[PDB]
Tab-separated table of C-alpha atoms in Angstrom:
chain	number	residue	atom	x	y	z
A	1	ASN	CA	6.659	19.226	-83.331
A	2	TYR	CA	7.728	20.107	-79.783
A	3	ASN	CA	5.877	23.411	-79.420
A	4	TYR	CA	2.784	21.769	-77.886
A	5	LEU	CA	2.689	21.488	-74.091
A	6	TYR	CA	0.175	19.670	-71.902
A	7	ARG	CA	0.252	20.026	-68.103
A	8	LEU	CA	1.805	16.970	-66.464
A	9	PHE	CA	0.523	17.848	-62.955
A	10	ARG	CA	-1.365	20.319	-60.754
A	11	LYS	CA	-2.179	20.803	-57.051
A	12	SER	CA	-5.921	20.731	-57.676
A	13	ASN	CA	-8.434	20.575	-60.509
A	14	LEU	CA	-9.537	23.374	-62.820
A	15	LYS	CA	-12.645	25.516	-63.179
A	16	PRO	CA	-15.085	26.001	-66.073
A	17	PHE	CA	-13.344	28.142	-68.740
A	18	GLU	CA	-10.125	28.659	-66.786
A	19	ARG	CA	-6.528	29.207	-67.940
A	20	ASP	CA	-3.198	28.964	-66.117
A	21	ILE	CA	0.059	30.242	-67.596
A	22	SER	CA	2.623	30.402	-64.711
A	23	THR	CA	4.924	27.595	-63.820
A	24	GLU	CA	6.560	25.972	-60.857
A	25	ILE	CA	8.143	22.555	-60.511
A	26	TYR	CA	5.686	20.330	-58.694
A	27	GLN	CA	6.656	20.007	-55.052
A	28	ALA	CA	5.001	17.713	-52.515
A	29	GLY	CA	4.956	18.636	-48.806
A	30	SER	CA	8.378	19.642	-47.514
A	31	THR	CA	11.868	19.514	-49.133
A	32	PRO	CA	10.967	22.046	-51.905
A	33	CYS	CA	12.722	21.265	-55.212
A	34	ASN	CA	13.724	24.767	-56.350
A	35	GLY	CA	14.333	23.327	-59.813
A	36	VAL	CA	16.357	20.316	-58.567
A	37	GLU	CA	14.036	17.680	-60.131
A	38	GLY	CA	15.158	14.967	-57.662
A	39	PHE	CA	12.998	12.670	-55.550
A	40	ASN	CA	9.580	14.311	-54.938
A	41	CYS	CA	10.407	16.930	-57.562
A	42	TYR	CA	8.617	16.662	-60.902
A	43	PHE	CA	8.494	18.872	-64.003
A	44	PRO	CA	5.075	20.509	-64.699
A	45	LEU	CA	5.730	21.157	-68.408
A	46	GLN	CA	5.448	18.275	-70.919
A	47	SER	CA	6.643	17.878	-74.520
A	48	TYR	CA	4.962	15.988	-77.391
B	1	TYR	CA	-6.814	-32.672	-44.065
B	2	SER	CA	-3.798	-33.270	-46.275
B	3	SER	CA	-2.368	-29.726	-46.647
B	4	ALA	CA	-3.217	-26.209	-47.887
B	5	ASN	CA	-2.018	-24.371	-51.027
B	6	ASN	CA	-3.248	-20.764	-51.193
B	7	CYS	CA	-5.277	-19.288	-48.042
B	8	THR	CA	-6.721	-15.830	-48.691
B	9	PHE	CA	-8.046	-15.577	-45.107
B	10	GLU	CA	-6.947	-16.889	-41.749
B	11	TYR	CA	-8.337	-16.489	-38.548
B	12	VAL	CA	-8.606	-17.064	-34.825
B	13	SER	CA	-11.605	-16.027	-32.718
B	14	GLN	CA	-11.915	-14.897	-29.104
B	15	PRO	CA	-10.609	-17.036	-26.226
B	16	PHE	CA	-12.994	-19.198	-24.173
B	17	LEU	CA	-12.797	-22.554	-22.280
B	18	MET	CA	-14.297	-26.083	-22.460
B	19	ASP	CA	-14.918	-28.922	-19.929
B	20	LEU	CA	-13.822	-32.055	-21.966
B	21	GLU	CA	-15.295	-34.811	-19.676
B	22	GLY	CA	-15.110	-38.570	-20.375
B	23	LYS	CA	-18.309	-39.487	-18.561
B	24	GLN	CA	-21.893	-40.421	-19.462
B	25	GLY	CA	-25.019	-38.353	-18.942
B	26	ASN	CA	-27.851	-36.195	-20.183
B	27	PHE	CA	-26.911	-33.119	-22.173
B	28	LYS	CA	-26.449	-30.482	-19.462
B	29	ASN	CA	-26.026	-27.649	-21.987
B	30	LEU	CA	-27.232	-26.461	-25.389
B	31	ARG	CA	-25.602	-24.811	-28.412
B	32	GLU	CA	-27.185	-23.082	-31.420
B	33	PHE	CA	-25.593	-21.666	-34.579
B	34	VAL	CA	-26.919	-19.966	-37.700
B	35	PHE	CA	-24.386	-20.023	-40.537
B	36	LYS	CA	-25.261	-17.740	-43.433
B	37	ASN	CA	-23.818	-16.016	-46.432
B	38	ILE	CA	-25.182	-12.688	-47.643
B	39	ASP	CA	-23.807	-10.566	-50.505
B	40	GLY	CA	-20.368	-12.237	-50.435
B	41	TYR	CA	-19.706	-11.912	-46.705
B	42	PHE	CA	-19.855	-14.837	-44.308
B	43	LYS	CA	-21.459	-14.525	-40.854
B	44	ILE	CA	-22.319	-16.741	-37.858
B	45	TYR	CA	-24.606	-16.441	-34.789
B	46	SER	CA	-24.774	-18.376	-31.514
B	47	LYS	CA	-26.281	-18.783	-28.077
B	48	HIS	CA	-25.651	-20.973	-25.069
C	1	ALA	CA	11.212	-15.884	-61.427
C	2	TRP	CA	9.652	-12.987	-59.501
C	3	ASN	CA	7.800	-13.543	-56.219
C	4	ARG	CA	4.032	-13.185	-56.330
C	5	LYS	CA	2.390	-12.507	-52.963
C	6	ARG	CA	-1.067	-11.706	-51.607
C	7	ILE	CA	-2.119	-8.647	-49.604
C	8	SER	CA	-5.491	-9.363	-48.029
C	9	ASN	CA	-7.614	-8.140	-45.115
C	10	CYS	CA	-5.425	-5.344	-43.781
C	11	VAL	CA	-4.796	-1.591	-44.108
C	12	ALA	CA	-2.089	-0.154	-46.366
C	13	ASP	CA	-0.544	3.338	-46.308
C	14	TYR	CA	1.520	5.786	-48.355
C	15	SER	CA	3.018	8.079	-45.673
C	16	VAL	CA	5.303	5.211	-44.607
C	17	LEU	CA	6.813	4.952	-48.126
C	18	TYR	CA	9.180	7.911	-48.395
C	19	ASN	CA	10.019	9.333	-44.993
C	20	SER	CA	13.727	8.496	-45.248
C	21	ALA	CA	13.072	5.812	-47.923
C	22	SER	CA	14.464	7.961	-50.761
C	23	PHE	CA	13.903	5.216	-53.278
C	24	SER	CA	14.928	5.441	-56.958
C	25	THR	CA	11.521	6.035	-58.533
C	26	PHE	CA	8.035	6.221	-56.995
C	27	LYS	CA	5.092	6.732	-59.345
C	28	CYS	CA	1.563	5.480	-60.033
C	29	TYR	CA	-0.630	5.194	-63.126
C	30	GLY	CA	-4.244	6.326	-63.407
C	31	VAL	CA	-4.251	7.906	-59.932
C	32	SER	CA	-1.968	10.221	-57.964
C	33	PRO	CA	0.321	8.332	-55.526
C	34	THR	CA	-0.337	11.058	-52.949
C	35	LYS	CA	-3.978	10.025	-52.472
C	36	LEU	CA	-3.443	6.300	-51.930
C	37	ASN	CA	-5.192	6.801	-48.581
C	38	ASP	CA	-8.682	7.746	-49.859
C	39	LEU	CA	-8.790	5.157	-52.641
C	40	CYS	CA	-10.080	1.702	-51.719
C	41	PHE	CA	-8.831	-1.372	-53.618
C	42	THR	CA	-9.692	-5.088	-53.488
C	43	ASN	CA	-7.524	-8.252	-53.575
C	44	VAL	CA	-4.115	-6.569	-53.683
C	45	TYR	CA	-1.265	-8.665	-55.106
C	46	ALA	CA	2.451	-8.193	-54.433
C	47	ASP	CA	5.077	-9.001	-57.082
C	48	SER	CA	8.763	-8.342	-56.485
């Protein structure tokens, strides 16, 4: 069963009864990943 | 001492100087110290 | 036969870990590596 996703990372915490749907590869500071997934580039989506 | 195995703290204090005479006489000076240990931290006090 | 070391009585940092370091993999468990600054440990070991 690989249809269940849990967020790997986020910039900040959530709020009471809040939902996020949109997706970007986590990027820290400069050198934006743009889907490269190299050093300092991490994938937000996670698979069970 | 013989030697030392595993030293979690080392230390040198502030510079100062001493007379080191080899003579005989009344104690021209005085030194006081209060060693103490409170809540896991060592401390010392002094006066000349 | 790894080397076990002791990190004691000093200040660590994270910003000096990647600027040109470009290591293979940098990650941390139970806390974000980005916020190593605010967290405050005790009796840090070093094994390599």
